[PDB]
C-alpha cells in the first residue's frame, strides 16, 4: 500500500546511447557502431550508410 | 547412387547456375553479338567472303553452349533426386 | 543511332527525381518511415549520380576505341 516513487535529476553525466533498432537495420547499426558506440542523440550514420 | 545432402544441394545449385548462364551465352552467340567475338573459333580465311561463315561458327558455339546447358539440366535433376533421397 | 544527350538525361533525371522527391510523400506513417525515406532519397542521389557520370564520360569523346582487324571486319557487316 505504501507507494513506489520515481525521481528525475538534472544530470551532468553522459547517458547511454540507443537507436530503436529493427530486424532490417540491426546489421547496419552494428556495423556503424563497431568502430565506436555513438554519443547522446548525435547524428546516427546508420540510415545513410 | 547416394551422397551427403549438402554435396547434393551444392550439385543442384551448381547445375541451375550452369543452365541459366549457358542459356544466356547460347542465346547471345546465336544472336551473333559482337561482344563475344574472340571466343568464336574463327579462322583467318573466313574474313574474305562474308559474315555468314562467322555466323555459322557463332551458332556452333551457341549449340555447344546449349549442349552443356543440357548436361547441366541432367546434373540438376540428378542432384535433386539425391537431395530428396536423403 | 539516335543516342542523343537530350532524352536519356530527361528520362533518368525525372525517374530518380520522382523516386527521391515524390515517393516520400506517399510512404505511409510508421516507425520505419525514417529509414525508408532515407533509402529513397539516398538511392536516388547515388544511382542518378552514378549513371550521370557514366554517360558524361562518353559525352564529347576524346579518343576512339582500338580494335583488332578481325573485329573491324566483322562489325562492318554486323553493326550500324
> Grid coordinates 549457358 are at which residue?
B22
B44-74: string of b/e by CB count within 10 Å (b at 16+)? eebbeeebeebbebbbebbeebbebbeebbe
| DSSP type of residue A44 | P
Instruction: Look at residues B24, B30, B20 and name the one whose alpha carbon lies nearest to residue B76.
Output: B20
Residue A48 is nearest to which of C31, C32, C42, comparing CB atoms?
Answer: C42
CA distance C31 to chain A (A): 9
Annotate B24-80 with DSSP letters as a single string: HHHHHHHHT-GGGGGGS---GGGTTT-HHHHHHHHHHHHHHHHHHHHHHHHHHHHHH
Long-range CB contacts for residues B37-41, cutoff 8 Å, separation at least 24 = B37/C70, B37/C71, B37/C74, B38/C71
Phi, psi for residue C35 in degrees, rounded to 5: -65, -30
Contact B8, B62 (CB under 8 A): no
Beta carbons within 8 Å of B42's beta carbon, 6+ residues apart = B54, B57, C70
CB contacts of B54 in chain C (<8 Å) are 74
A39: left (phi over 0), alpha (psi -120 to 50) or beta: beta
Cα–Cα distances in angstroms (integers) from residue B5 to residues B8, B48, B82, C34, C48, in the given order? 5, 55, 7, 43, 45
How distant is the Cα of B17 from the closest Cα of chain C, in angstroms?
Answer: 28
Q: Which residues of A touch C33 (CB under 8 A)?
A: none
Nearest CB neighbour to C38, from listed A20, A22, A48: A48
Burial class (CB in 10 A: 0-12, 13-18, 19+), C16: buried
State whether C42 and A20 contact (CB < 8 Å).
no
- What is each CA distance from B67 to B19, B23, B31, B75, in whole angstroms? 10, 10, 17, 12
**Cα distance from B61 to chain C (closest Cα, Å)?**
17
CA C35 to chain centroid? 24
Structure determined via: cryo-EM
Separation CA A17–CA A36 (nearest Å): 11
Cα diameter, chain A: 51
Give chain C positions within 8 Å (CB) of A24: 32, 35
Amino acid at each position: 500500500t505504501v507507494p513506489s516513487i520515481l525521481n528525475r535529476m538534472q544530470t551532468n553525466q553522459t547517458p547511454p546511447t540507443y537507436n530503436k533498432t529493427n530486424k532490417f537495420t540491426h546489421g547496419f547499426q552494428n556495423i556503424v557502431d563497431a568502430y565506436g558506440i555513438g554519443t547522446y542523440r548525435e547524428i546516427n550514420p546508420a540510415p545513410y550508410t | 547412387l547416394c551422397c551427403g545432402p549438402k554435396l547434393a544441394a551444392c550439385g543442384i545449385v551448381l547445375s541451375a547456375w550452369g543452365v541459366i548462364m549457358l542459356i544466356m551465352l547460347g542465346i547471345f552467340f546465336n544472336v551473333h553479338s559482337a561482344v563475344l567475338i574472340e571466343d568464336v573459333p574463327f579462322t583467318e580465311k573466313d574474313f574474305e567472303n562474308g559474315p555468314q561463315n562467322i555466323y555459322n561458327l557463332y551458332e556452333q558455339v551457341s549449340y555447344n553452349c546449349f549442349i552443356a546447358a543440357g548436361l547441366y539440366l541432367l546434373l540438376g535433376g540428378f542432384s535433386f533426386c539425391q537431395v530428396r533421397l536423403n | 543511332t539516335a543516342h542523343s544527350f537530350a532524352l536519356p538525361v530527361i528520362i533518368f533525371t525525372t525517374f530518380w527525381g520522382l523516386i527521391g522527391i515524390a515517393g516520400p510523400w506517399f510512404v505511409p506513417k510508421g516507425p520505419n518511415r525514417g529509414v525508408i525515406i532515407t533509402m529513397l532519397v539516398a538511392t536516388a542521389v547515388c544511382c542518378y549520380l552514378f549513371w550521370l557520370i557514366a554517360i558524361l564520360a562518353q559525352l564529347n569523346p576524346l579518343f576512339g576505341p582500338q580494335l583488332k582487324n578481325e573485329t573491324i571486319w566483322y562489325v562492318r557487316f554486323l553493326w550500324e
